[PDB]
Coordinates of C-alpha atoms and ligand atoms in Angstrom, one line a residue:
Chain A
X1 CA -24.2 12.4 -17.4
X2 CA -24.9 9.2 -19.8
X3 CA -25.7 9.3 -23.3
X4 CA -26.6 5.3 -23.9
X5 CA -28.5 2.2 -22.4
X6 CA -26.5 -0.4 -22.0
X7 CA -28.1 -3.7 -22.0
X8 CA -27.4 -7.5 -22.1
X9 CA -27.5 -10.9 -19.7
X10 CA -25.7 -11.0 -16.2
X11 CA -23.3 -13.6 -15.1
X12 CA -24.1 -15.2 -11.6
X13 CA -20.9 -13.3 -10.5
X14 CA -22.5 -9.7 -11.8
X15 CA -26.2 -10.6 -9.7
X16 CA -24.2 -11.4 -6.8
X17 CA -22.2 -8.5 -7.1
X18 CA -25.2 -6.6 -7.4
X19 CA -26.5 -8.3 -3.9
X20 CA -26.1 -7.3 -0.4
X21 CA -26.8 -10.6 1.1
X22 CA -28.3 -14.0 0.9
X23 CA -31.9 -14.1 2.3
X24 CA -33.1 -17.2 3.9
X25 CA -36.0 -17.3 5.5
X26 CA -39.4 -16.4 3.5
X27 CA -40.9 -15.0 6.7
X28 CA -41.4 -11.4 6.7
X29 CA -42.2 -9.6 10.0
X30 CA -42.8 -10.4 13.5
X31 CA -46.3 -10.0 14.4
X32 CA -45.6 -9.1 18.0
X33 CA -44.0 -6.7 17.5
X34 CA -44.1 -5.5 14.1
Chain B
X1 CA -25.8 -12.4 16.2
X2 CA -22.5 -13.3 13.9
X3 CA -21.6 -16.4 12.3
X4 CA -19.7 -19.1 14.3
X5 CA -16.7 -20.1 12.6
X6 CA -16.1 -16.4 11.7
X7 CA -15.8 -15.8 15.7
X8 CA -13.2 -18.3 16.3
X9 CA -11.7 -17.3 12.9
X10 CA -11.3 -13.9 14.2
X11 CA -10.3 -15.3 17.6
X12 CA -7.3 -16.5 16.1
X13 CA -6.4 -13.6 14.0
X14 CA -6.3 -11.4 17.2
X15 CA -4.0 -14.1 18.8
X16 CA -1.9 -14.1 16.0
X17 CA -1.8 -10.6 15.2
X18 CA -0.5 -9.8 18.8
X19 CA 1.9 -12.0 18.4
X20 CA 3.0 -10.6 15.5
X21 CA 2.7 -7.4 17.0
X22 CA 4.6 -7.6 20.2
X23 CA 7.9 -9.4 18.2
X24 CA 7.6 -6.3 15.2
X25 CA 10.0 -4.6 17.6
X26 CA 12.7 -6.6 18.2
X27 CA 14.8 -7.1 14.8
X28 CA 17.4 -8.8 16.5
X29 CA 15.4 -11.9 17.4
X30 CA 13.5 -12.6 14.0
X31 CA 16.1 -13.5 11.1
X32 CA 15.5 -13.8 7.4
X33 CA 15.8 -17.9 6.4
X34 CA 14.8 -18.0 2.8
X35 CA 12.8 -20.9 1.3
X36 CA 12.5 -20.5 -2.6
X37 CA 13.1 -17.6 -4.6
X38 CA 13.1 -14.6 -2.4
X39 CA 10.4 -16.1 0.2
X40 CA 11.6 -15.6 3.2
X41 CA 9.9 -17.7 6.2
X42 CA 11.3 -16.6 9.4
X43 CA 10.4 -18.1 13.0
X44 CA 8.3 -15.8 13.9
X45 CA 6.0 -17.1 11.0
X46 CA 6.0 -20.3 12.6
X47 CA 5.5 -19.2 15.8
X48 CA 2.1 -17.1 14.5
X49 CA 1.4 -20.4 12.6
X50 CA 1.7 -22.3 15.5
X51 CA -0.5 -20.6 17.4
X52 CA -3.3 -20.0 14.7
X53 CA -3.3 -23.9 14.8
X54 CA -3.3 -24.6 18.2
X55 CA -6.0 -22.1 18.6
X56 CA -8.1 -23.8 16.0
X57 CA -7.9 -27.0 17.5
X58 CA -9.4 -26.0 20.8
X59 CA -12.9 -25.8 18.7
X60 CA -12.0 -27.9 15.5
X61 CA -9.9 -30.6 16.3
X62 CA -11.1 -32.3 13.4
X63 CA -10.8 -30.0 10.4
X64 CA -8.2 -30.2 7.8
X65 CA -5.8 -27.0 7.6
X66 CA -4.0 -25.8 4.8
X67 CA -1.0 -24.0 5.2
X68 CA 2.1 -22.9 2.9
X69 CA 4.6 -24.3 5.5
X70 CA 3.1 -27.1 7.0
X71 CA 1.3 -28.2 3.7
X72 CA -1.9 -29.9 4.7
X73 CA -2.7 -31.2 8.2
X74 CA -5.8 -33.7 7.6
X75 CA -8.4 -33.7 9.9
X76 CA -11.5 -36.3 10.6
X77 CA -13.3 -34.0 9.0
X78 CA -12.3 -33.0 5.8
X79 CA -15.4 -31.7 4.0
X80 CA -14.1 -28.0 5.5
X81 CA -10.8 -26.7 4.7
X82 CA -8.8 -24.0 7.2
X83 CA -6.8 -22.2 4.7
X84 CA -4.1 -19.7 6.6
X85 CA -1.1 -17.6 5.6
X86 CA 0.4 -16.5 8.8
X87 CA 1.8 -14.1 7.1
X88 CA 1.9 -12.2 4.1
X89 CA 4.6 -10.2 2.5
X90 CA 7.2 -11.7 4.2
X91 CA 9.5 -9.4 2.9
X92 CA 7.4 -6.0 4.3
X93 CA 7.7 -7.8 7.5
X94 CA 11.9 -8.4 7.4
X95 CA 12.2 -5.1 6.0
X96 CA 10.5 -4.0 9.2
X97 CA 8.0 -2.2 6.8
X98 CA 5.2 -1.7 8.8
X99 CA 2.6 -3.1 6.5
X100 CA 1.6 -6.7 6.5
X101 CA -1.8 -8.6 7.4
X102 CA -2.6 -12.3 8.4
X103 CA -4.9 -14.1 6.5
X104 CA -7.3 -16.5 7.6
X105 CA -10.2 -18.2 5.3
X106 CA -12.6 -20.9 5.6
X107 CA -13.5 -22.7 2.7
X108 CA -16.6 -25.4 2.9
X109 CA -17.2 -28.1 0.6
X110 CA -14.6 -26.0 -2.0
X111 CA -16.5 -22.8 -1.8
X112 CA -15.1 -20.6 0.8
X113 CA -17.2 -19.7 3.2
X114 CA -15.7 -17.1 5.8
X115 CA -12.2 -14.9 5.7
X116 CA -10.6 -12.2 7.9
X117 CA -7.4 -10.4 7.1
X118 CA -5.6 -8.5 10.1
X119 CA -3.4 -5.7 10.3
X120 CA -2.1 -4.9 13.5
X121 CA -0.1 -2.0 12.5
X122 CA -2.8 0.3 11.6
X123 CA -4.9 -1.8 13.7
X124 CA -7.2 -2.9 10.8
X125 CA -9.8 -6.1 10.8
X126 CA -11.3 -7.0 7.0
X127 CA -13.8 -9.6 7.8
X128 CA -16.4 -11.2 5.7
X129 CA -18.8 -13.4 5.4
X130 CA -20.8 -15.0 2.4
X131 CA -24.6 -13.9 2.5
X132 CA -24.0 -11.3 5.7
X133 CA -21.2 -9.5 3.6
X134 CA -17.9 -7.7 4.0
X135 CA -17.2 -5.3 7.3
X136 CA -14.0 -3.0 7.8
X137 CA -14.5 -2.8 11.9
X138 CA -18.2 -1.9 11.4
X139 CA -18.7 -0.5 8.1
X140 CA -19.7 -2.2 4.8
X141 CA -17.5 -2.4 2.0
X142 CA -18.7 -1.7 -1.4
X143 CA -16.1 -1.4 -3.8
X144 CA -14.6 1.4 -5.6
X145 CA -17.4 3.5 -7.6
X146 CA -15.1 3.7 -11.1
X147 CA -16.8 2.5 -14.3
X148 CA -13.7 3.0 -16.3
X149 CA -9.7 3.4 -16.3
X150 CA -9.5 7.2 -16.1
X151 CA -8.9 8.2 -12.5
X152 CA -8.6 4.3 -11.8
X153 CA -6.0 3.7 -9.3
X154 CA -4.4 -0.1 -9.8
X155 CA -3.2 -2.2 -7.2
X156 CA -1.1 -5.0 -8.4
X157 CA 1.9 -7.4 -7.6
X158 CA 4.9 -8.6 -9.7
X159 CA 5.7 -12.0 -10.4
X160 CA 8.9 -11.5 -8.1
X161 CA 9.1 -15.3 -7.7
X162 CA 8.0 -16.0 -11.4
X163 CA 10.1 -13.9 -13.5
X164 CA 10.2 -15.2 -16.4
X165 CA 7.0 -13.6 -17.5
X166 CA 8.0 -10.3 -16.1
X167 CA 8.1 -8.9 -19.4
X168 CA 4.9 -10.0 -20.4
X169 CA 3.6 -8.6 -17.2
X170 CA 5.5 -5.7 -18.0
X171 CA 3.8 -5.1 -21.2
X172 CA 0.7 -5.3 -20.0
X173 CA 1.8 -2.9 -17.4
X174 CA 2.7 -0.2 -20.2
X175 CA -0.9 -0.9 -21.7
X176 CA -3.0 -0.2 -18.2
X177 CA -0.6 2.7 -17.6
X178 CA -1.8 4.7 -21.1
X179 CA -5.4 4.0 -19.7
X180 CA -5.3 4.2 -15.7
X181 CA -4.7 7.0 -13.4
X182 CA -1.5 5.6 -10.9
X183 CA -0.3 2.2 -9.5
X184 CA 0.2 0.6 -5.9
X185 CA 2.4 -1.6 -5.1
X186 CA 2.4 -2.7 -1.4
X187 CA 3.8 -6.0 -1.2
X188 CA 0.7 -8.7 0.2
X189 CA -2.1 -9.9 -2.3
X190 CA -4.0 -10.1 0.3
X191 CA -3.7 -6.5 2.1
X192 CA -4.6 -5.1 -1.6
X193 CA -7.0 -7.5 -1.9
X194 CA -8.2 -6.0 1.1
X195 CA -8.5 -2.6 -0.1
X196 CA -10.4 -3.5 -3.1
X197 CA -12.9 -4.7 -1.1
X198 CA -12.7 -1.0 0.6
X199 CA -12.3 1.1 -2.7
X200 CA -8.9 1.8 -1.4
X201 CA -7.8 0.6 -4.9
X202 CA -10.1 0.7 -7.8
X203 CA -9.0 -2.7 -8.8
X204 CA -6.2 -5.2 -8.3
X205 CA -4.3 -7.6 -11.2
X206 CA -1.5 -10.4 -10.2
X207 CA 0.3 -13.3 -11.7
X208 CA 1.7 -16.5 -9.9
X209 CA -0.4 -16.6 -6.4
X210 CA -0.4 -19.7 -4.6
X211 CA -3.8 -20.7 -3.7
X212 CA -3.5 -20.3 -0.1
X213 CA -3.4 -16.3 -0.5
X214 CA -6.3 -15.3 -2.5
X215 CA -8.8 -18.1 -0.2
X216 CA -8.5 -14.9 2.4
X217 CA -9.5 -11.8 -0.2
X218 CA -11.3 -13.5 -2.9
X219 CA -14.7 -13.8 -0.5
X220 CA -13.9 -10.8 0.6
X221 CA -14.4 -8.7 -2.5
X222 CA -16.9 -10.6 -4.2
X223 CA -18.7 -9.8 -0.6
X224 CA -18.0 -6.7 -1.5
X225 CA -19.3 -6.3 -4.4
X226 CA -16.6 -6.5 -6.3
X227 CA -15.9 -9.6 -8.7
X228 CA -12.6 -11.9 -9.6
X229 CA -11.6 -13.2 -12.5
X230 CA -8.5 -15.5 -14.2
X231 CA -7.2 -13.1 -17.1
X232 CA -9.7 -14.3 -19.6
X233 CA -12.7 -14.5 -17.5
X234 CA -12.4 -18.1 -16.7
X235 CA -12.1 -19.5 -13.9
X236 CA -8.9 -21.3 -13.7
X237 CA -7.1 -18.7 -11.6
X238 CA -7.3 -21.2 -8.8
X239 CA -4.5 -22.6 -10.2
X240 CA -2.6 -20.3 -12.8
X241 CA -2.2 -17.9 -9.6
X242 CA -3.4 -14.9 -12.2
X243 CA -5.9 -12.7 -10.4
X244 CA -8.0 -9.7 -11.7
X245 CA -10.7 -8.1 -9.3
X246 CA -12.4 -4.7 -8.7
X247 CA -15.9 -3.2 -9.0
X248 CA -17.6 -5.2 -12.2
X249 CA -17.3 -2.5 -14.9
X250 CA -13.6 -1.9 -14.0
X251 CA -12.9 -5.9 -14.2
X252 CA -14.8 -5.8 -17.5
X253 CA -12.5 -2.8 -19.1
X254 CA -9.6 -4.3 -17.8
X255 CA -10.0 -7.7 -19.3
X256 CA -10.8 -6.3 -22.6
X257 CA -7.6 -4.0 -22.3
X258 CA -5.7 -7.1 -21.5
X259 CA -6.6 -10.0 -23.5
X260 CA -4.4 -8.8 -26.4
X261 CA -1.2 -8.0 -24.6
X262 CA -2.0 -11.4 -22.7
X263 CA 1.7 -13.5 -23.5
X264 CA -0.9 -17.4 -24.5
X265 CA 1.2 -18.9 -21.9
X266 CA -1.1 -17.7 -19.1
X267 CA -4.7 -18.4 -21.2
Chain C
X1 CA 19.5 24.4 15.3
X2 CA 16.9 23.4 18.5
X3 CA 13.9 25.7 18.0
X4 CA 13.8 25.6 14.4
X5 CA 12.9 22.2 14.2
X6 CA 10.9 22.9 17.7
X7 CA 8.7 25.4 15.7
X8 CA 8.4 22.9 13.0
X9 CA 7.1 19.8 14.9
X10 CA 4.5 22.0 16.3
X11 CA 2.9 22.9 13.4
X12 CA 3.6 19.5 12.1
X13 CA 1.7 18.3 15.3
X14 CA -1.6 20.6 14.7
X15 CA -1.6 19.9 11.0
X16 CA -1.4 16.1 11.7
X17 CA -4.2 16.9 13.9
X18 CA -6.4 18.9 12.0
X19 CA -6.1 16.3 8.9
X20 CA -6.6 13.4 11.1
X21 CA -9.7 14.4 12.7
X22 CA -10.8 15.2 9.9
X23 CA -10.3 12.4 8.1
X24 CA -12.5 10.5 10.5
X25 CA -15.2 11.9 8.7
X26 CA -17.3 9.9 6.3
X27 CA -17.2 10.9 2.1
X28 CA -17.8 8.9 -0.8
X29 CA -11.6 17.0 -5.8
X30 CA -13.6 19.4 -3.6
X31 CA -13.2 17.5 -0.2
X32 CA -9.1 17.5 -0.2
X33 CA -8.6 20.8 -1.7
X34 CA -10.8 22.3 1.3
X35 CA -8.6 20.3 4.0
X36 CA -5.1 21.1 2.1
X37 CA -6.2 25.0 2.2
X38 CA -7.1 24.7 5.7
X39 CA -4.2 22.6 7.0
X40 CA -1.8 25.5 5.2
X41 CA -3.9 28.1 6.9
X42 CA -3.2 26.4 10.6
X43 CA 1.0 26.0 9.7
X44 CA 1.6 28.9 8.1
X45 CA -1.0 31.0 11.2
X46 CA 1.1 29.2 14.0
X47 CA 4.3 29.9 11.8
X48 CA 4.2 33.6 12.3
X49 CA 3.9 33.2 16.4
X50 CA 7.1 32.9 15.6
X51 CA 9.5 34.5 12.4
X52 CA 6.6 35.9 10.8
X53 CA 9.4 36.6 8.5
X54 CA 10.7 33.8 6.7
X55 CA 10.1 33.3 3.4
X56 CA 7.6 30.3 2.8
X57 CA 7.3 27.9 -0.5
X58 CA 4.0 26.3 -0.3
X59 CA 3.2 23.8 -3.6
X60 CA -0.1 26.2 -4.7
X61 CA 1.0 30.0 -4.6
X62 CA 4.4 30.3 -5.8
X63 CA 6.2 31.5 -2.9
X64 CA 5.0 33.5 0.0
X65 CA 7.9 36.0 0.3
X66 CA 8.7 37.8 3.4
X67 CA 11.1 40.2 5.0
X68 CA 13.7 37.9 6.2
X69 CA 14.7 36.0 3.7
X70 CA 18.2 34.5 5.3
X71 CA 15.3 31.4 5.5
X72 CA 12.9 29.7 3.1
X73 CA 10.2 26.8 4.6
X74 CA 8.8 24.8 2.1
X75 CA 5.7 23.6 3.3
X76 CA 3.5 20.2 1.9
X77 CA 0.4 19.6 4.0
X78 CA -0.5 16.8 2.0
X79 CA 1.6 14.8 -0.4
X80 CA 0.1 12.1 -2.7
X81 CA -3.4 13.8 -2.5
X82 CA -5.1 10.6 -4.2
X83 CA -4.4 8.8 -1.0
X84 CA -6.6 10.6 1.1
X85 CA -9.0 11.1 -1.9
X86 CA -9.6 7.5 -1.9
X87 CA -9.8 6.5 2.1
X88 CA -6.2 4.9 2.2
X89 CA -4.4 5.9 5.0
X90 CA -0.8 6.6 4.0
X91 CA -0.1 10.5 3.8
X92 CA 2.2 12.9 5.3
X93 CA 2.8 16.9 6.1
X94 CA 6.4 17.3 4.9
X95 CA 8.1 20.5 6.7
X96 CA 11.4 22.2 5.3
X97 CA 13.9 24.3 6.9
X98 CA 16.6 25.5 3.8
X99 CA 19.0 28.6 4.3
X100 CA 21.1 30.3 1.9
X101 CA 19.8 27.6 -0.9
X102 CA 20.5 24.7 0.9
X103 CA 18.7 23.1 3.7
X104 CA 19.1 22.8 6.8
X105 CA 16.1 21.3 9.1
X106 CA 13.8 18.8 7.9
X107 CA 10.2 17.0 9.4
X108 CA 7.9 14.5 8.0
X109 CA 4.8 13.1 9.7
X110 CA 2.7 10.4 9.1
X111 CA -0.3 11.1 11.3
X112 CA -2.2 7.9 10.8
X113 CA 0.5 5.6 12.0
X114 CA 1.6 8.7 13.8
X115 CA 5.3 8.2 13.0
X116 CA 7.6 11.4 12.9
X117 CA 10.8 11.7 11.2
X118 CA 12.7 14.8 12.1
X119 CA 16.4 15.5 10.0
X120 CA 19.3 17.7 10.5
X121 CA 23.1 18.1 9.1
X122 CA 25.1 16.6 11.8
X123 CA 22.5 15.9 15.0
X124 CA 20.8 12.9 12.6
X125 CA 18.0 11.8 11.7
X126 CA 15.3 10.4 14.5
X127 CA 12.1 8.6 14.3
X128 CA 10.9 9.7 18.1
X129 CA 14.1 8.8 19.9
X130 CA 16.1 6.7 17.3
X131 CA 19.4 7.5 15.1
X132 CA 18.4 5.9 12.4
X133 CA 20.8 3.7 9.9
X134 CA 19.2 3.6 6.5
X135 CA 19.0 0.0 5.2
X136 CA 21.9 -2.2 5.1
X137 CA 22.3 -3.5 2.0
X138 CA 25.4 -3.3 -0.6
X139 CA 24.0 -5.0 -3.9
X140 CA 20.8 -5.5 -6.1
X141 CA 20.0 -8.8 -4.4
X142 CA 17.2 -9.4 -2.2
X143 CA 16.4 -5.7 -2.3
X144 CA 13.5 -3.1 -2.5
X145 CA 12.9 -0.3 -4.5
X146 CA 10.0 2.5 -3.8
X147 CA 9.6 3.3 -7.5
X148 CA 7.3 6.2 -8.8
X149 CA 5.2 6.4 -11.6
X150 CA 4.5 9.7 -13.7
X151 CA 0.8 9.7 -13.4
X152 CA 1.5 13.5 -14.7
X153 CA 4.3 13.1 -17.2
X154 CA 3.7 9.8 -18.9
X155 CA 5.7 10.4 -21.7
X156 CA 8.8 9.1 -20.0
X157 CA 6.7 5.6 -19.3
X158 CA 8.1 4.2 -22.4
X159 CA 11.6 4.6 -21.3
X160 CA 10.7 4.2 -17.8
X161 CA 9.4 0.9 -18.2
X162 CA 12.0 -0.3 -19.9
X163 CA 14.0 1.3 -16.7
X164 CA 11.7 -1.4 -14.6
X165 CA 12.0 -4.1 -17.0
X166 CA 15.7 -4.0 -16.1
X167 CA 15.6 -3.2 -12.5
X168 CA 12.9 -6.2 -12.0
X169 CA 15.8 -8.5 -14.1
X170 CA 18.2 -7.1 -11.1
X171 CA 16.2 -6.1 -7.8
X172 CA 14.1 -8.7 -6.3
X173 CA 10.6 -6.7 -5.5
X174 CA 9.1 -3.2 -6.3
X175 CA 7.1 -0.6 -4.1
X176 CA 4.6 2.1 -4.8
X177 CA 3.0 4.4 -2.0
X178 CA 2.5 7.4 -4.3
X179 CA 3.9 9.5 -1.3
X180 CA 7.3 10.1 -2.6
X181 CA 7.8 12.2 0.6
X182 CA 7.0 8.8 2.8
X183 CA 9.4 6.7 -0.3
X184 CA 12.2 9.2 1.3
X185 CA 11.4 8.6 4.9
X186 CA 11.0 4.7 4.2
X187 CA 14.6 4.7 2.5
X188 CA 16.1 6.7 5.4
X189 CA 15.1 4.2 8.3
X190 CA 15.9 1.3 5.5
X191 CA 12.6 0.3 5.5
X192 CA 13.2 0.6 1.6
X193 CA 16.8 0.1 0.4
X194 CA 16.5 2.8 -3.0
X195 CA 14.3 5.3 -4.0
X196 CA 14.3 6.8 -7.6
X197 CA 10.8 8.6 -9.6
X198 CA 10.8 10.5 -12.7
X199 CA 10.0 14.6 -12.2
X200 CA 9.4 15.6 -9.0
X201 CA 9.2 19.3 -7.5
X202 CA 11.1 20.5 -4.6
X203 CA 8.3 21.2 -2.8
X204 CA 7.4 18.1 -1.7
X205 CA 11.2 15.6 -1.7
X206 CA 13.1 19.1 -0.2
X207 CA 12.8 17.6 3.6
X208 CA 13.2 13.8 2.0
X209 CA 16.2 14.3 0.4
X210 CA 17.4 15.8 3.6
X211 CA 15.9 13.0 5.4
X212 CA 17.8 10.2 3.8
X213 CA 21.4 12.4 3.5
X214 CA 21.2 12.8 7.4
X215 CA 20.6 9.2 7.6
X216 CA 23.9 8.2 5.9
X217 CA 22.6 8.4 2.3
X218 CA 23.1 10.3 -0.8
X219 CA 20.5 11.6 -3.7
X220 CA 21.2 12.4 -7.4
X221 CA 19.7 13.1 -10.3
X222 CA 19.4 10.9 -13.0
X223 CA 22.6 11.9 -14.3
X224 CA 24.7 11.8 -11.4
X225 CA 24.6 15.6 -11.1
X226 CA 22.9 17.6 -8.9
X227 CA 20.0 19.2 -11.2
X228 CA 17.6 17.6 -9.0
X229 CA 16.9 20.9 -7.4
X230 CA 15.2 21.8 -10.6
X231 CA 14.1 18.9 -12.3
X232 CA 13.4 15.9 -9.7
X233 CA 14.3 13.2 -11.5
X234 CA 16.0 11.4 -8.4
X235 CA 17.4 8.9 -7.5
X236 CA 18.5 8.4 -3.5
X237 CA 19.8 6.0 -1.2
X238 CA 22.8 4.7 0.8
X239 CA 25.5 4.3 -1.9
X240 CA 26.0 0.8 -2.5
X241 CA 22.1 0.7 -3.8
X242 CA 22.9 3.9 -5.2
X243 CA 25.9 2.6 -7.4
X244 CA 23.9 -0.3 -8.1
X245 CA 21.3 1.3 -9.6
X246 CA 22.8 4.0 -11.4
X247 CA 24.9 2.0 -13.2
X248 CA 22.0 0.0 -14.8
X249 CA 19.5 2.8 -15.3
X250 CA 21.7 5.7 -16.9
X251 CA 22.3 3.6 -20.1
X252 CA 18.5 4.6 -20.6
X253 CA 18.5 8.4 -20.0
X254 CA 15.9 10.8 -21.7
X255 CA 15.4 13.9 -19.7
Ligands
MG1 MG1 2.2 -16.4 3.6
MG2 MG1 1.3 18.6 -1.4

């Protein structure tokens, strides 16, 4: 396939291309039911 | 669960799109009566217009709306904008073409928020929302895969209303067709729009948009992990009506094929 | 002139069918080469039920002669391949009926929006039930045109372009489907007022060209004769649009 590493910074609009979402809410997992 | 405002967004696209729908076969009722330069708004828009509005107003009687015919309704509330085009492509729809969408976006506090496109014809509903994503009635959208020009199909639109740039565009067209594989031309910026967001189109270009068609697609690829650009990489597209979108690689080659032929008029 | 074209929707039906159904399955050139081979296998198997005989033109092999060759069907099962390589849902199986060199029975089908255009010299050409008009229009004002693109013959582009650069100072908007079969239908129920593309094969345009004649219009080649047979440079319509656009885009000829 690829012969080279492309590398540099990201603009806001690439990392939020790169996204599949917005999360919100820093809890994790129900503990009732897990 | 599913976002508010998208529901009675959607809500009113269905409305609309049945409307739309059930007068798509009678040709003798709906004339053509031109506004500008070959932009046609018929009745039946401002039927579907009227009926997106009155719709609206059962749950937000106090939002502003913006809309190409009736210009901009205020509303007690006018940190959230409703930004509609009843319909788009006016001229697929006199034609009787059977390809047209309406477009309905929600922009709040300038960022746009929410947007659904509808296409009764094939029966199609684009909707997305920022931070949930884009959905094509249940599945995600995600772009075309390209990373270059070669097998690239372009979507794109003509300036039609504005043109005296047509050559420029023109040349540029010449340029992308040494590089890409084949063109689309469909007739509504926000239908192709649409199908970048599906990878229907491996990109999408267009000059002299008004700001009320875009609102619709604009969240809807970048939800899509596609991206949007002015032809420079700016961001004044807002206002010159000059669009380029697609999967992020495919934006980047483009812009860097374009920025020569680019007539200074549009930078 | 019935069961011709009664023979031809059916296998137009099934192959709708088969490509349909299977287009409802999930993918992200193998794919479309495998559905093409097997949508020619189902016509051209239901084809010999009846006049196993008839001399068949597919757009792979050439042409599949046979004993009775008072009748040639060209057959496309898929036109505009990139569409249904890349999910968007505007494709048709264009059927041909020709005799003695000429045609005489034609059928495309659009199986997504399920739309069926059936064609032939004298009876007309229907969409389900309707004699069909072609557009109305007599000038290059407020008109459309399905253009083409030679996404296999670019060298033309130049002078093509310069073609659209002068038809966009005269038309008012452009089209491009990539289904020049579905161009033709579109032009023969005036969805689209001209057609025109750069190089084309028989294969595919044989049952549009019959399409929009039936429906009151006319093709050409790009110089007005009638070398379009062999080189499918064409250019079809009702005449006004016809006139209208000949008479600007000859001046720029190269083939
Ligand atoms: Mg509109
Ligand atoms: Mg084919």
């Amino acid at each position: 396939e690829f012969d080279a590493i492309k590398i540099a910074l990201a603009s806001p609009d690439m990392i939020r291309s790169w996204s599949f979402g917005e999360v919100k809410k820093p809890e994790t997992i129900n503990y009732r039911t897990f | 669960a599913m976002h508010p405002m998208l529901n009675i967004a959607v809500r009113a696209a269905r409305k609309a799109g049945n409307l739309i729908a059930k007068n798509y076969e009678t040709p003798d009722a709906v004339e053509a009566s031109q506004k500008g330069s070959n932009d046609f708004v018929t009745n039946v828009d401002k039927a579907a217009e009227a009926v997106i509005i009155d719709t609206i107003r059962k749950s937000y009687p106090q939002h502003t709306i913006i809309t190409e015919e009736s210009g901009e309704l205020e509303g007690t509330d006018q940190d959230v904008q409703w930004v509609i085009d009843p319909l788009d492509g006016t001229t697929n729809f006199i034609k009787r073409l059977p390809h047209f969408a309406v477009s309905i976006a929600v922009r709040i506090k300038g960022r746009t928020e929410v947007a659904v496109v509808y296409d009764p014809m094939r029966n199609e509903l684009f909707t997305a929302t920022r931070g949930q994503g884009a959905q094509l009635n249940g599945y995600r959208l995600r772009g075309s895969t390209a990373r270059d020009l070669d097998g690239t199909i372009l979507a794109t639109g003509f300036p039609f209303k504005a043109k005296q740039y047509a050559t420029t565009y023109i040349n540029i067209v010449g340029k992308l067709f040494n590089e890409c594989a084949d063109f689309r031309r469909t007739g509504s910026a926000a239908l192709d729009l649409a199908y970048v967001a599906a990878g229907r189109v491996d990109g999408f270009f267009e000059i002299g948009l008004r700001p009320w068609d875009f609102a619709a697609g604009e969240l809807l690829v970048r939800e899509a992990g596609g991206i949007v650009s002015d032809f420079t990489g700016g961001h004044n597209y807002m206002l010159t009506g000059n669009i380029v979108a697609g999967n992020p690689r495919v934006v980047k080659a483009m812009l860097a094929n374009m920025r020569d032929e680019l007539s200074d008029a549009l930078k």
